[PDB]
Amino acid sequence: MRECISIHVGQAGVQIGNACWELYCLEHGIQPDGQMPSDKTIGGGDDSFNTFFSETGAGKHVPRAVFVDLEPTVIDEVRTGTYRQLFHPEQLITGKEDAANNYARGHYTIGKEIIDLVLDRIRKLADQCTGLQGFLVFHSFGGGTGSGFTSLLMERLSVDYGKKSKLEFSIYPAPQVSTAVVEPYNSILTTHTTLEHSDCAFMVDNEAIYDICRRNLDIERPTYTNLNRLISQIVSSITASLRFDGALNVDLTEFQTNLVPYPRIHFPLATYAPVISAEKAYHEQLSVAEITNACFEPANQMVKCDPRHGKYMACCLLYRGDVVPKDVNAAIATIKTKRSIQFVDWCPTGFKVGINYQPPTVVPGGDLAKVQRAVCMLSNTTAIAEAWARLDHKFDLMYAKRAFVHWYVGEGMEEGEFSEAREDMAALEKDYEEVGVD
C-alpha cells in the first residue's frame, strides 16, 4: 500500500477539498467522528482506502491531507464544520491576510514567509507513509494564493520529493462566477513556473461546471456549493482507482504513463455522465452505450472545446456502477462508427477501461441524483489547447496596455516574468498544433 497526500491551496482548493473528503467518507463509510465500523483492523492496516486515510489508536481515520490558505476564513469553516473531527489542527494552516488576487503577492511576498511551515506539516504526513506515491494539489488559477503559492509549493515539492508524482486539479477562470479581472495574468504566471513540476493536471473550467448545473440540475444561479459537489464527483471518479481495489490507475505514476506521452502536454480533457437532477420526478436510467456516447458531447466536458477538430493521444474510460465489459465494447464499437475520433498516428487507437462496481455516491440532500452507473472519460486532446488560446488572448489584451502590471512589480516581481511566462504559453500552444494539425 502506497499513500497519497492531498494538498488544498487557496479558497477553491480548500472548499473543493472539503467537498471531496465529505464524499470520500460517504464512499468508504467513515463517519464525521473519524470512526469506520467496517474497518476490522483497528489502529492500522494497509487496505486500499488507507492510501488516503491514516489510522490512530482510538480507531479514527484521519485524511492524508493538508489545507493551506493565506487567510483563515475559509479554513475556519472546516475547523468548526461537519467534519471538524477528521483533521487534527496541524493539518489546517491559515495566514493573516490573503494575496488579494496578486500572483506575485502569494508567490513572493507572502509565500516566502509561510513556505517552510507548509513543507514541515507535509513532512509530518510523509513520515506516516511507508511508500508515499505522490501529491494531489487542488487550487484555482485565478486566486493570488491558488496561483502564486501553489507554483512555489510545486517547486519546493520537486526538491524535497524528487521521485514523487505530482498531479493537479486546477480551476480555470470563468467570468460568470468571478469578480476578479487579473485572473488571466495569474493563470499564465502560475502555469509557466508550475509546468515542469506537474506530471498530470486536470483543468476544470468553471464555465463548464456552471452550465452543467444550470442545464442538467436546473439551478438558475449555481453557487460554489453546487459546483463543488459536482467537481468532487469527477475528482472521486479519477481518484477512485487509488482508494478502491482495482487494476487501472492503481498509482499516481499510471496517470502519466497512460494519459501523458509528452511531458508538457499533460492536461487531459475530462468528461462525466450522467448528471441527473435529484428534484426530478424520476429519471430513466441510462445505459452503458448512452453514457459512453455522452462522453463525446461537449456539453458535459470539464472544459468547453471541440475534440472533433483535435487529435486524441490517449483515452481512459472509468466506469462506476452496474457495468460489464460486454456492454462497454458494444458501445465503443458503436461510437467509432458515428463519432469523429481522430487519433495521432504515433499512438494506439484504443481505450484503457476501468470498472468499479460501487455506483456513484451522492451526498444526501444534494443536487445530484443517485444513478446506477456513470463514467468519466480522461482523454488527452489537442482540442484542450482552445482553453490556452482563450486565456492567452485575454492576457494579450491587458498586457498590451500593461494594465494592472504595476500591482505585480510592486510585490517584487520583475516585468520580464510576464513576457517570459507568455512566451512559454506561446510555445505550449505551438506544441499542441504540431501534434494535432497536419
Binding site: 513572493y108 509565500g111 526538491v159 478502491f244 481495489d245 484504443g350 470498472i355
Partner: protein, 54 residues
C-alpha cells in the same frame, strides 16, 4: 476489436480494448528568487520613505 489485460475482483474489473494499432531549480536557486524579489520590494519602499522624508 480486441480485449487485453482483463482483471476481475470483488469491487469491479478493468481491461483494455484496442480498435486499431498505431502507425529543476535547486533549493538554493529558489532562495535567490524569493530574496531577490524581497530586495526589490525593499528598494522601492526605501525610495518611498526617502520621498516622504524629503
Amino acid at each position: 476489436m480486441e480485449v487485453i489485460e482483463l482483471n476481475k475482483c470483488t469491487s469491479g474489473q478493468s481491461f483494455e480494448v484496442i480498435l486499431k494499432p498505431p502507425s529543476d531549480p535547486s533549493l538554493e536557486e529558489i532562495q535567490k528568487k524569493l530574496e531577490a524579489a524581497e530586495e526589490r520590494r525593499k528598494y522601492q519602499e526605501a525610495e518611498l520613505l526617502k520621498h516622504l522624508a524629503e
